[PDB]
Structure formats: C-alpha cells, structure tokens
Symmetry: D2
Subunit: 184 residues, 4 copies
C-alpha cells in the first residue's frame, strides 16, 4: 500500500511546547504589555511570515488601542549570515516617529538580523523600541540584543510550528515541535 499519512503532525519527533502552553503564555505576555503600555502609542511590528501566528495571538491579548504593521525582508547572500544585513521587500507603512514600537518575533537565535532591524527602526526615531519573542534559543546568540518579553527559552533543536517553517511548511502546526531529520 502506497497510501500517505499527510498530517504535518506525522513529521514531528516531539512536541516542545503545546498549543495550551502557547495560549497561556500569550495571555500572560499580553496582560503584561497591556499594563506596561497604558498611555503609550503602541505599534506592534512583526517580520513576515514567521511572526503571523504570534502577532495575531499576542495582539488579541493586549487590551490597548494598538496598531499593527509588518516588514518583509530577504537575504543579500553570503552576507546576511554573518552580519544579519537584509534587504527590505516590504517596509512598514506606519510612521513610527515618536511612537512606542514593540518588535514581535517568532524566534530569536543569533540575534544578528534582529539587531540589524532594531538599528533600522531606531533610525526612524520611535519614542521607544522594545522586543518580544515567543521563542528564544539563548545558546545561539552572536550579538547583544535585549529581549524585553520572552515566551519560552529552548535548546537549539530543529523546530517548526506556530508560524515557524521549514521550506514554507509546518507554519500551521498549533504547537512548537522538533522536526524529524528525515524531512530536512
């Protein structure tokens, strides 16, 4: 029988963070941000496409009159890997000067690209600029970035899910799972 077992879940070796754990953490972070940004001009900026799930969940967990925007970027080649420099394919449309920007990330590891985007956004004179990520791989750090809000710290395993892909697949997994080596 050459039938298939199509569910993306079949390609996962183990679940590191469950859907419920993600849901609870998003609620937690959102309540914190609601308190911290009262009276502020909050703009959530996420980097497509990995940030979509966390952006959606986190924003709905923040009880404030915030705005949302996105950046779409691409690599210049054997340069983005060691410097974190990226090309802008879609820039944010909201004028962030004098506003309180919160970068919303899916995962932070080397911190190289994040540091580069941080400097680019700072160049637009926001009143404040902070960072929030649902996942962090501290052991992978190659640059100094301050993570103001962090969901979960995990080891450097090959993960996918909740927006994180592998060749554009697995973003729709409702949890963070370790991808079976046979797939990569």
């Amino acid at each position: 029988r050459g039938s298939h077992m199509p569910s993306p879940m079949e390609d996962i070796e183990e679940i590191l963070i469950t859907e419920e754990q993600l849901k609870a953490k998003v609620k937690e972070l959102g309540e914190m941000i609601t308190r911290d940004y009262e009276g502020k001009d909050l703009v959530l900026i996420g980097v497509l496409k990995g940030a979509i799930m966390f952006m959606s969940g986190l924003s709905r967990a923040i009880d404030l009159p915030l705005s949302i925007d996105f950046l779409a970027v691409s690599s210049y080649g054997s340069s983005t890997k060691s410097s974190g420099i990226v090309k802008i394919i879609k820039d944010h449309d909201i004028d962030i000067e004098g506003k309180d920007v919160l970068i919303v990330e899916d995962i932070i590891d080397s911190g190289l690209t994040l540091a580069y985007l941080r400097e680019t956004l700072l160049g637009r004179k926001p009143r404040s600029l902070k960072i929030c990520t649902i996942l962090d791989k501290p052991e992978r750090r190659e640059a100094d970035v301050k993570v103001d809000y962090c969901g979960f710290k995990i080891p450097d395993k090959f993960v996918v899910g909740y927006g994180i892909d592998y060749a554009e697949k697995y973003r729709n997994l409702p949890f963070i799972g370790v991808l079976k080596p046979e797939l990569y």
Copy 2:
C-alpha cells in the same frame, strides 16, 4: 476627572460575532478544507493586513501540509473604488502555477478588489483557485464572485475587529463589533 477608558472594547456599540463563535467557525471551516484539499497542493494567500487573524486561525485548523503567503496592495486613487484595481506593494513569493490556491479574506462586500486579485492570480496558472472569507456583506456586492467557504453573513454595519481596522485601530479586538459613530 479627565482620565481615559483606553480599552478598544469601549468604542464598540454591539458585538455581532463573539470570540467563541469565531473560534468555532474557524474550526468548522478548517475541518472542511482539510477534507476537501487532501492530496492537493494547498497554498493559502491572504491580503495584508486585515487577513492576519483569520489566516492564523484557519491555517492552524487545517490538518494538511499547506504553505502560506501574502499580498500587500494599495489604491491608485479614484479608480480602485469603482474598478477594484489595485497596486501591488508586496507580491506573493510562492510560485502558484499548478498549485491549489485558497484566497483567505477578512471581509467581502463589493467584491471589486477581490475580483481583480482573483484575475491576477488566475494569470499565474494555479491548478485551482478558491475563496474563503470569515465575513461577508452580501448586500454590498457590485461584482460576481464565488465564495467557496464563508464564515458569517452580516448586514452592512460599520464593523471592526479580528483583523478589520478603522484607521489602523481595532484589529486586535477578539470579536467582530459595530464601531460607535463617534469614532468615525
């Protein structure tokens, strides 16, 4: 006392569709799409930024190895209003030729811009092209568009929430609500 009442919920006159109703409908639609697209090469394409909430929820409710992509568009002026013609600010990166594309929309009313995007995507030779929207205002139709999957049909009220904005605000409301006229 000049204190404020910052919650975006305070600007809502009435809730048309609750968070729970949205959650249940997304689960329902996702289970249907999971069945209908088994064996297909599913690519969900949403139009930023309104489609973010529905895209996130619907994708996670589809138990298939799908890919996600986005389009970011803008108006040409007093032309997009009567023809639905739009400028492409961010095109999709995934090659959809020979694939099964499902347009994911936040709301469909006139259907003008949707019809225009549909024709543009058809020009890229996908194997199939369907449309799914969480909200539909049938009375507003100005063009003939077939909605393959539809969450809720609503009257032509001024709504915001679940990704739908008013001057970039209210996208983070977890429900679909009618905006108080004082705000617009």
Copy 3:
C-alpha cells in the same frame, strides 16, 4: 605582467549598433511618437533595469508633456521561462486608467514576459497601450506581440550594452555589442 585591461569594451567581440546609430534612431522614434501622441495622455512605462538607457534617451526625444514610470520584476523559477509569468517587486505608481501607455523595452525576443506584462497593464484600463523597443530579435519569438515602434532588428547573438547586462555588467556600454564567449 599581470596587469588588467578593465574597459568593458575589451570584452566585446563586435559592435552591432554604434552609439551614433542608437542616438539617431532614438531621435527618429521620438519625433514619430511626438506626432502620434499629440493631445494624448502619454505615460512611458519601462521595466527596470535594462530599460533605463532607452527610457532616458527616448523620453528626451519626445516633445510632449509625458510622465514616466517603472516596473521592477522577478522570476518565480522554472515558470517564467515558459510562460513569461513574473513577480512584481516594484509596481508603477501612476494611475494609468484612461491614459495612453507606451511600454518602453530594451530588447524583445521570446515576447513571453512582455505579453504577460501587457495583459497586466491592460487590466488597469488604460485608454491605449502600445509597445516600443530599441532592439528586437524576431527569430526568438514564442508569443504574438505587436511592436508599434522598433529601433533595430538583430540576429540572435549574445548582446550587451545600452542598458542590457550580463551578470549586472556592461549596461554602461554606449553601443550594442556582442559579448565574447569567454565572459559567459
């Protein structure tokens, strides 16, 4: 001695069209277009980056109150080659509805991508849409495109110059030349 001979001209096997021939043809075409578009709402649209030299020269040879705009595109992969389908990286900003658009091309060979862009522009309802190219390789045609204005017809040789590149180089040659096989 390992000294170099840096001039891009050293990489040319033969000159097919001289700088003077190009200059005279641009003047000729511009005078024709000046006559044909009197009273029209002329918008010259070129595809970056190859069209830059011809766009600059042709526009300055047209004695009419025209506007200029550009499209920047990219390939989707093993699809643009047989269908001419392309991704839009930079769309034109000018609203061309009801206007008289003249596509300005560097070279036309298969006509596949040109045909695709033509259909895309027609979708924006211009009053008229014509095509002008400085170079044409008729033997390479794979689609039916009408060239309203044409500078020179040439055999299918490997050419560069006057905006036409090879790995981003040679666009600055003031003539159309055949590239030495050793370079490609």
Copy 4:
C-alpha cells in the same frame, strides 16, 4: 482659438543649464570617476525616478566594469520633511558589502533625505561610499553631507528637467529650466 502649445518647453521661464552643458559635464565627471575607481568594485546607486537621466548619462561616460542599481522611496508624512526619513518601496538588489558605492543624485538641497539614505547604505558595510550629483543648491542645506562629485551649483530656483519633475511632468526636458510660476 483654443488651440494648445503642448511642448513642455513652453512652460519654462529660463534655461539655467543647457543640454550641451549637461552633456559636457557628464563627460567630465565620468572621466574623473573612471580614473578614481580603476581597480575598484563600482556600484552606482540612484534614487528613482529623478536620477534616471543622470544615471544613464554618467554611467555611459564611465569606462569601467560597473554595476547599476536603484532605490525607490516614499514619505512617511510630516516626518520626512524635517528628518529626511523615508520608507523603502524598492531596495537595491546588489549586495554592496565590500564594494565601492557611488550614490548618483539628481539634485541635492537640504541633504536630509540623502543623509538618511547614506546612513542606511553605510549599514550594509560597503568598502567605500561617495556621492555624485548633477545639481546642487548649497543655500538649501540643512544637514552636513559631503558631495564628492558635483555637476553644477545653482541658486534656489524652482527647477525641472533632466529627470527632475513637477507633478511627474518635465522629466524629459533635455535641459535644466526654471518653471513658470503659473504652472505651480
């Protein structure tokens, strides 16, 4: 008689810089750059759409194996005026790290946007970064920018031509002229 006098030249009050003067200056600057960048990895980067005429002419006057690229930008509103901050609509595709970049400008007045783009390009680690402009209005300066190559210094008159527009018109004038106040 309600006949028109369509030539863009009819809207010019006086010619500040003739076509021949521009041609000679472009030849001059190009010969200088040819000498200065021998052995360098020259990348000319211009800001659309005003830089098109000068980019075309200057590049063809440089006898070196250079590459050309462009940036397309937009304003964020009442912010770009005092800070020079701009949104990126089209970023350059060439990786400029370790390369010798020459910004090619149509006109420099306040220097605000130029200074902002300069900082953005420096962030991509080019080996060297210089600036070349065909026109300069020194009295308009609001920021400190070093112009390595300059064609002509002019008073702060309302000019158009050689790529410089007024409501998208006049870019095709072969000279730099003062626009009649009746048109603006």
